Symmetry: C3
């Protein structure tokens, strides 16, 4: 059985991220370029800060026909004391994609399946829907509030941005 889990990834530009290592044959992004990154992670309902994303985008090619890039991404999603989910697969700056769920820890131990990545605002706002299989238990309620429908205009709740107790999960990852 699938448990859907949605999250918002936001680059608030206060984590030194992205760091672009530019090595390619080309002026534009190309093979050789590496982009270590880490962004903030909020619940799908945008009410709470949960943690961070962390990992590496490997540039594969520039896609001039689509005015964008293909990356191959290896990274994790951190949910404070709940644990983390890890993923591998395509990040395309110009369209939605699906990544493999490579595993998890904590409540996410045994996780498998795929996750849909939707870019909302390039490069600062992304929305994910994990189609989670293999979990030992029902996901905690504070993570499964009805998601805010994805649009360019979404914002984390002000109390979550401000890191107030009501706007964070316990020991949210930073």
């Amino acid at each position: 059985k699938v448990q859907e889990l949605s999250v918002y990834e936001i680059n608030e530009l206060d984590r030194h991220s992205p760091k672009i290592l530019k090595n390619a044959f080309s002026l534009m992004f190309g093979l050789g370029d590496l982009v270590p990154f880490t962004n903030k992670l909020y619940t799908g309902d945008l009410k709470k800060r949960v943690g961070i994303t962390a990992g590496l985008c490997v540039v594969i090619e520039h896609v001039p026909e689509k005015k964008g890039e293909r990356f191959e991404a290896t990274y994790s999603f951190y949910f404070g004391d709940y644990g983390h989910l890890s993923v591998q697969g395509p990040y395309l700056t110009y369209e939605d994609s699906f990544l493999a769920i490579t595993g998890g820890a904590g409540i996410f131990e045994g996780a498998y399946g795929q996750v849909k990545l939707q870019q909302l605002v390039y490069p600062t706002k992304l929305f994910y829907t994990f189609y989670l299989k293999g979990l030992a238990n029902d996901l905690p309620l504070e993570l499964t509030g009805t998601p805010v429908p994805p649009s360019k205009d979404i914002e984390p709740a002000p109390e979550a941005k401000a890191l107030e107790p009501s706007g964070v999960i316990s020991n949210y990852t930073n």
Copy 2:
């Protein structure tokens, strides 16, 4: 339970790959050297272009007694409209290895198991057999044609090299 899927990975020298990021203090490959790469991917029967490989080889050590290198590889295999498979493990230029199937997406959602990598012609031709478990359905027939036995002089079908509809899968990855 297990569905065998074989593919040929071929470097046709037209994707700027591999890109060597040199950091080891050695004329040979060494720890510190990073190799982002992307090659073309064909069906096991060599009749169709399916997509590409994409990811990163991390050099671990030069192995002089084996006249080759040990890499640690993290990458994906793209199958056009069907989805992708992701892997992690040893790439040894000097001998066959098995990598872990970390997951998949699309028709490969839920994939697990191991994949045999056969070093056919260094570095331009590699042959893989995925021992796929966890798939929802039987693989599409166009992916499971009897593989061409691996040998040094294998070549994709001319229709596949030329990207004719008869020689590609739909939305083959490029």
Copy 3:
């Protein structure tokens, strides 16, 4: 069914590891810094050399309040002819963590679950406890001996450090 497996990872300073690829604009570790690494791997009881670890640590942030770093790690554990385990997740220099088991090969084909990482000496001695699901068979007895109590003072058996037949597994990874 869960099988527990513990191993010690030791940097014996003879594998050119770690290699620091410095890209952050600070004397301290920061986003942009990449650390390819490979250490030796011994049984939990420290009687036998089994192989190596191999992969990449991506620096995510310096954590000044904890006098340490957060890495995001992608790597494998090699057990000679037995195969390997692959992992994805957090390495925090200042506290224990859990990483996701992304898959395996050989006797570890089908492996999933999570692994505890405990740092004993930064960066030269670490102790792991894998909580392994999905294995086809019981772990071999030579891998499941009672672990030596974890501390800063642990050392491999002299036969294992010296690579004597009684102190190594069959075709231990090097």
